[PDB]
Design a protein around this nucleic acid. Structure first.
Lengths: 115, 101, 87, 97, 100, 118, 84, 101
DNA sequence: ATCAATATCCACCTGCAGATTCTACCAAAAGTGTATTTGGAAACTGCTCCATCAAAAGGCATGTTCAGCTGAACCAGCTGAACATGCCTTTTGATGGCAGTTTCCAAATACACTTTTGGTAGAATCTGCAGGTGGATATTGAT
DNA sequence: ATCAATATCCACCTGCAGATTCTACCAAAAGTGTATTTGGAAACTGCTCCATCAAAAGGCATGTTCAGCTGGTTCAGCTGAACATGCCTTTTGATGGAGCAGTTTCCAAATACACTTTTGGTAGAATCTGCAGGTGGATATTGAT
């Protein structure tokens, strides 16, 4: 009668690390639409994975620049504010314990004829 | 008494800028902020309690708001061929961002 | 007299040097003496609005404790989304 | 049923970090920021997709609404690569049924 | 299927005109203005319903009641406008519950 | 069996003009919540009525000051910008054919007859 | 369908002056006009970019007023009077 | 009269301000605006059509945006003890609003 | 502070472009009657917060000293506002395939149930890094 | 330019609080089979965009003059930055205890489902009327002298 071929996750079929079942559950639970198609959560999970990889990549680069092996919020803020597209997308977001980018307006510094 | 060292105005200010822009620690004392929060909340509802992380979150939000406003204020000051920020600069920054009152 | 000492003149705990430090992070080199009182007022306006909304969320849940999530949502409606405290 | 039941995206963020930069860890605070970030972008995309479907009197969310939401919400060069990744994922999923 | 196909399109126009006649009996309103008021009403509708939905979801509640509406009003509207709107809403719910 | 008492409506019961039933239908249709309580649309309709009356009242006053019997978008813009609370709520809204409020910065005005001192 | 080129210059100096006048501006430098044109073009691009996206989703070739309203809405510039 | 009458600079501008602040008619020409819109749209999608109300909506939004920016720009100009607006005023206002240019 | 030109506001006056009013139609609200879900009352858990207090501590307050900023005033000359011509460029008015229904049958997806097993709370383990000494180097100011 | 006085960066060591792994387990993902929804072709269809032209008509590109604004220069008054002491409020780390968020159970109360009956709201065709524009004066604006 029933054979029960072994299970395989949707993430592995899609070649993703982020899940699909949970995203589907979250779309159903949250009043987004009456029904949710099978392809929507794959596309969304892939998008979330790419953007996560982009932030983690730039933050790890900033970490190596400061000779640190662990990513802290400061590195994420530096990564975002130095990247035009991430800065635009996250223009109204505050990263806790992130600080600010170094920036002194040129006219407030003393004149360079000092010697 | 003999030949005492004294830095010129601006050097130490710049050193403080460099220092605080390099670090991320919170600059306001926790307890006075807690007392301010409790006073304000008390004027809306009595005997309120607070989680410690709620106060820390408010501190982060407040400081981010002030730093952004001081940056805009500084650009307004520089625009007027000045280097000193004045109340009229804050009022202008607040008006353009739409934080009118 | 059980608890909850009345809170009065606590805005002065936001001292001049802390405001100076915040201005320094903003790149300000020189600060007029009249800035400090104005800044204190500005902060109070922001906080009141935030706390007003946070406590409203508290009241809807029939809770007496303000959580971090209530603050995050209150800030979201003011367009100053905060990351790092859950959600 | 003890002590409680929570959930996060923590395990998935760590995998991406290990694939892109094998020799790197992550603090608990930073992981919290990424979870907040993911939830925010999730809400933004799903909310926009919902509005589009309502305007077009459609009760179903398909890969088309997500793609469109991405092009509206993300800026310039970021959207094309995200769309390409989503498309490749959908084609691989439909092929590997 | 009728011989002359023609659609339907709802608006809040007639109710706005009734309110206008109540507040200023000797006054009309242009079609553009009525359209602006309809847009306004739709905007406040979406804002309140969306916020109430969000509040309900955060507290794991599946029902939107007059409580969430009241709270939404207090969050979105300022001061005395909020107090008067709340009073009108409370009066209406109390009259409805009795006037079955 | 049936009596089928003559139809009454919820707007009439609440003493309102705005449509409770339609608001109820709009909440159900729009993915706001799975279920909707009976009191929510009454309260919301009442709020919308109050706001409509306030706006129309102020625009009508501006219209009478201009000696016009019909309200145009301009009168609504003038009403909104002269009311602190409506301006806050509608701080990021553009009213088509509304224009702007008259406002000239004092510095832009001529010196005075003190320049024509004679 | 004729190709359109060099058309931002149809937004003439006096129209920009009139707009500045409504803004309460009394005197205007000559270099403002080109800068203003560029600013307007950017704004328009973003709106049209979003409007056409809504159009494409519905498989329509006509941009409606509602598409523009929604594009403006997501940019925080809600417009009343042209529908919904 | 021997010499034609001429108002001094700073009078006609004020008359124009009062006139345009009293009226609501659109100040940009319909035709060049429509042509520009079609030109910009062409680089994104081919063979597009436009409803007339879409162009009127875009015109209302554009003029309201520019008017708001000129108000803020004028306050920035006045702040610098000037009465003449310059490009640097627009750039400052747009920077404080958070717009990418 | 009187005089020329000027623009702008104030009273009639008309037909016309809407704006209001009124019949017919019907989707859509409301009225019964059942089923199915619930949010509020009560109880029990234990755990996060609050008040208060004994002892450094490094932060802040006042009080001095002064280089350097602000604001005001003054002038060269350049700038852009008024204004007269006459011409493009815009305005209005004729004239000649794509958005919105209807149907369908079939891709796609809800709904119930069972099965597997991935994620998560918590005990063990590991390890990057704050902190602390210390040396060598980069900025700074008076001279 | 020269040189003593302070800051900054790096090299190194060492204990450790926070990050990473291994158990255990249970609520949720995933496969299977009924039954249900609606999405893309395919055929109307009517209506409203697109060029195109021709007659105006008025706003604006050009060019001219000239009031007056900007920005450079000088400089006197004051005034916040910097720094030396002494109070003294914030930090830590306990000690006690207390009352409230969280979870569970059970319930009368409240809302969806499904059907029928009935009517306010829209669409279109008929009347009402407020006012854009035009006509004619009266008087606040502005400026020259």
């Amino acid at each position: 009668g029933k054979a029960r071929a072994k299970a395989k996750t949707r993430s592995s079929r899609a070649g993703l690390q982020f899940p699909v079942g949970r995203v589907h559950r979250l779309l159903r639970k949250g009043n987004y639409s009456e029904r949710v198609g099978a392809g929507a959560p794959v596309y969304l999970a892939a998008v979330l994975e790419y953007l996560t990889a982009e932030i983690l990549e730039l933050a790890g680069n900033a970490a190596r620049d400061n000779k640190k092996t662990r990513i802290i919020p400061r590195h994420l803020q530096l990564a975002i504010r130095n990247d035009e597209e991430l800065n635009k997308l996250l223009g109204r977001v505050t990263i806790a314990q992130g600080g600010v980018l170094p920036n002194i307006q040129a006219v407030l510094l003393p004149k360079k004829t000092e010697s | 008494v003999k030949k005492p060292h004294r830095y010129r105005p601006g050097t130490v200010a710049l050193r403080e800028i460099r220092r605080y822009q390099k670090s991320t620690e919170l600059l306001i004392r926790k307890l006075p902020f807690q007392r301010l929060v409790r006073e304000i909340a008390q004027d809306f509802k009595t005997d309120l309690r607070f989680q410690s992380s709620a106060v820390m979150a408010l501190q982060e939000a407040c400081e981010a708001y002030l730093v952004g406003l001081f940056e805009d204020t500084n650009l307004c000051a520089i625009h007027a061929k000045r280097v000193t920020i004045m109340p009229k600069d804050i009022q202008l920054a607040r008006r353009i961002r739409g934080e009118r009152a | 007299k059980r608890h909850r000492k009345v809170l009065r003149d606590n805005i002065q705990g936001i001292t001049k040097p802390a405001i100076r430090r915040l201005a320094r992070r903003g790149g300000v080199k020189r600060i007029s003496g009249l800035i400090y009182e104005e800044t204190r007022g500005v902060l109070k306006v922001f906080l009141e609005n935030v706390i007003r909304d946070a406590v409203t969320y508290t009241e809807h849940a029939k809770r007496k404790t303000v959580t971090a999530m209530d603050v995050v949502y209150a800030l979201k409606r003011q367009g100053r989304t905060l990351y790092g405290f859950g959600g | 049923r003890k002590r409680s039941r929570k959930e996060s995206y923590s395990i998935y963020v760590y995998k991406v970090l290990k694939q892109v930069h094998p020799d790197t860890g992550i603090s608990s605070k930073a992981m919290g920021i990424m979870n907040s970030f993911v939830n925010d972008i999730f809400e933004r995309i799903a909310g926009e997709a919902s509005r589009l479907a309502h305007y077009n009197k459609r009760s179903t969310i398909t890969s088309r609404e997500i793609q469109t939401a991405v092009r509206l919400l993300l800026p310039g060069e970021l959207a094309k690569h995200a769309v390409s990744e989503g498309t490749k994922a959908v084609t691989k999923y439909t092929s590997a049924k």
